[model samples]
Structure formats: C-alpha cells, structure tokens
Target: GSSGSSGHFQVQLEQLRSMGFLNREANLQALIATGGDVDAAVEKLRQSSGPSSG
Candidate 1:
C-alpha cells in the first residue's frame, strides 16, 4: 500500500519499525493490509528474504 508516515498510523507504523520492520513503505503496506493485526505481518516480513539488510 503506497502510503506514508503521517498517515495517522504513525503509532503502530513506528512501533513496527522499532521492532525492525525498517522498510517504511512495506510497513505501511502491512498496516494497510492489516487492520492492526500486525502479528502475521511481522512473521510475513521474515519470510522469503531478510529484514535487517537488503
């Protein structure tokens, strides 16, 4: 979901980032994809590739 930080989802958005979901766009996608149920998104990001590094 091509979104932004000031999208009012800043709390959870930044929370996810602090948790290591550094990909800003991806994190917003997760929030958009999720309605707050970010548990899956967290693990989802851990799949098919790495998170901390490109």
Candidate 2:
C-alpha cells in the first residue's frame, strides 16, 4: 500500500506582524478567517483591496 505525507508550517499572527504584512488588529482578524494559513490571508487581503494596478 502507498500513502502520502504532507509538511506544514505554523504561521502565527506575530510572524505576519514581524514581516510587516499585517498589523495586530488585521492579523487577529486574518487568523480568525484563515485559520493561520498565510496564503489564505493574502488572498483575502487582495480580494478586499480589489484588482491590482498595472
């Protein structure tokens, strides 16, 4: 039989703050909505901010 394995990282809100990607308030909200997934948080921000500029 064959099985699959996965690797994951714990993305804390503090890490996001240290990276300057989110403030404390924003990080808290993102953590709630995305469950600590950085990619999810980023996508949410992009969606909220509308389309990117050229």
Candidate 3:
C-alpha cells in the first residue's frame, strides 16, 4: 500500500527543511524515512515550519 506514502512524507520533511525546522542531520534522517525524496521532504518541512521558525 504505497498510497503516496513516500511522497507525503517527503513533502512534510522538505517543508521542514526549507523553513529551517530540521537541521542537516534531521533533514537526512527525514529524507531517508521518505525514501530519499529530498524535494518533497523539503516542501513538507517548509510547510510545517510556516513563517516563524524557532
């Protein structure tokens, strides 16, 4: 049951990274979890981070 699992996960992680939510190591870990979809992960990371990142 793939169901875009990897895509969603990567999206989340990517968003976080872009928003500076996760550090380098965290980004790598997230990318790995999402199956190496750095782009998607970055998107996700950024989305989650929003405008205020602390």
| Model 1 lDDT at residue 46 | 66
Point out where model 3 deviates above 4 Å. 1-22
Q: Could you give candidate 2's per-residue lDDT for residues 6-47 as a string of tens digits? A: 323334654665666545566557667877687677677556
Candidate 2 lDDT at 13 equals 54
**Candidate 3 residue 14 C-alpha distance from true site, Å:** 13
Candidate 1 local accuracy as lDDT? Answer: 0.66
Report the alpha-carbon TM-score of model 1 versus the true structure: 0.56
lDDT of 3 by residue, 1-54 (tens): 366554434555566556655575667665676676777666655565558764
How many Å off is the CA of 26 in candidate 3?
2.4
Residue lDDT tens for model 1, 1-54: 357444556677667788877776776666667665567667666672465466
- Top candidate on lDDT is 1
Alpha carbon lDDT at 6, candidate 1: 48
